[PDB]
């Protein structure tokens, strides 16, 4: 099985190993597209405290194709990490970052107390809002929230509040420590998929009867070096009767001719059983390396002793041989 070199990986590392995250009230989004989604750096990592998929199991995810993958990132308290899930409610789930009940994706989070703390009030969350958020919405306005019946007129006051509240993140705080949260949302649209996981390839064995899968084509046969060249964009060659002639190898870009695995009729050459029960066997149109062994044009003949002396023909084999 052969697939081409992966030189275009999805930037999960850029999202996860970022020097800075956004506030949850103003969470960031980056689109992941037209790349290979290698999740082996996410699900085999012991550094994450939270790793839960609400869409599809990680064991299948690394073999699925999507049109778009979105990585939503923000910093919240450890006690609020549990709110980042479908069906949940709370100050973060309702006013800062809402996931739909039918969310398809994975929520990954880890402790960032060794960096994102001081108090560090750079990270903020929405405390008040007129109504909750729609799935994947964002609200970064600073309009003063009116809790009472008296117009706020743009300022704080009796039953009037600035909508945001900062996090008091300090190095000495588990529930009040900062956590970096990344949500990976995966979708399949009517559009062609653009992001697939990596595919593994096997080594290529030459001059042997094998099954094979090259890119998107399959078949069986023997792979040998070709003496023909293809145009720069061509992936495989085809014969007159529309059968595969050759394939261009995805990693080496070398061309390998494909021949059918040796086959042919097997016939028994025998004197009449009235005089002898000794027989010779002829394998038609095959090599003796594939099956008193005599290689001829008719096939590989076993049991008959080849001699230099010619005689009038008795039992015909073919191609001048009797």
């Amino acid at each position, epitope marked *: 099985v052969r697939f081409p070199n992966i030189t275009n990986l999805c930037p999960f590392g850029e999202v996860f190993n970022a020097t800075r995250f956004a506030s949850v009230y103003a969470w960031n989004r980056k689109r992941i597209s037209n790349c290979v989604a290698d999740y082996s750096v996410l*699900y*085999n990592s012991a550094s994450f405290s939270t790793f*839960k998929c609400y869409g599809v*199991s990680p064991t299948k995810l690394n073999d699925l194709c999507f049109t778009n993958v979105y990585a939503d990132s923000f910093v919240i308290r450890g006690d609020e*990490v*549990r709110q980042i899930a479908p069906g949940q409610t709370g100050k973060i789930a309702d006013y800062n970052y809402k996931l739909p009940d039918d969310f398809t994706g994975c929520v990954i989070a880890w402790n960032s107390n060794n960096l994102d703390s001081k108090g560090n009030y750079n990270y903020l969350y929405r405390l008040f809002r007129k109504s909750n958020l729609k799935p994947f919405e964002r609200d970064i306005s600073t309009e003063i929230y009116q809790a009472g019946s008296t117009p706020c007129n743009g300022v704080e006051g009796f039953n009037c509040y600035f909508p945001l509240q900062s996090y008091g993140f300090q190095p000495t705080n588990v529930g009040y420590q900062p956590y970096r949260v990344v949500v990976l949302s995966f979708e399949l649209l009517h559009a062609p998929a653009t992001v697939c996981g990596p595919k593994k390839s096997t080594n290529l064995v030459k001059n042997k009867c094998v099954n094979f899968n090259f890119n998107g084509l399959t078949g069986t046969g023997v792979l040998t070096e070709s003496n023909k060249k293809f145009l720069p964009f061509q992936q495989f060659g085809r014969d007159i009767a529309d059968t595969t002639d050759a394939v261009r190898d995805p990693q080496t870009l070398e061309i390998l001719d494909i021949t059918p695995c040796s086959f042919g009729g097997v016939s028994v050459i025998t004197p009449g059983t009235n005089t002898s029960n000794q027989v010779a066997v002829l394998y038609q149109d095959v090599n003796c390396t594939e099956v008193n062994v005599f290689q001829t044009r008719a096939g590989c003949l076993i049991g008959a002793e080849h001699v230099n002396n010619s005689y009038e023909c008795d039992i015909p084999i073919g191609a001048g041989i009797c």
Partner: antibody
Amino acid sequence: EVQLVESGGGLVQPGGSLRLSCAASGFTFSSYWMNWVRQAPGKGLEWVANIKQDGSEKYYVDSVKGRFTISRDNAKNSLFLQMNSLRAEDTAVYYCARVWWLRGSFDYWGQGTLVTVSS
Amino acid sequence: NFMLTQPHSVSESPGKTVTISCTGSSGSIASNYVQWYQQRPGSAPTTVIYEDNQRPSGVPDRFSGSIDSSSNSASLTISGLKTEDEADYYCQSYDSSNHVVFGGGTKLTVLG
């Protein structure tokens, strides 16, 4: 068809040491996480150690830290546990198991090798 | 560090449904996947339920479960109890304070 085969149990004195092994086939070792899980008689299950697919990293439960070493050989198709300074409290049945991914399930289990510590 | 605990004695009549629970402390059980294992006497525990609600081949649809995130707990239910279901059941999850965390086990008896 995936199978796990264990050996190396028996009676050891306190402060002594031994190596347990879990030979296996039906899969490529370098593609899977390998673990040891312990169960003392009359007790529930507890985790002892975890080793990464390529052996590049190792994890231990605090109770065996500094005493037990988890190691693997992907060419010999076998998982090993080297247990040093064994204590009376370490008397237990040791199981080997295969894990698809770090936070996933233990898909295959051995039968369990009994180690008894007594002077 | 995060730990799991279970009830010792759980039992129910054959043909009926029994609930086996597991609770967490010093961390959140719902932040990771929960597995359930069944150990019949004489051998090793094997997976019955994994990743909250999935099951391996050989396990019937009588085995299912969920995680109650607001209660920091999880459970499985076994419907249609058979006398072959007598076993020691275990819960397992993952944390950063304790990599692989197992519960103390539940003894399930089918009241035949």
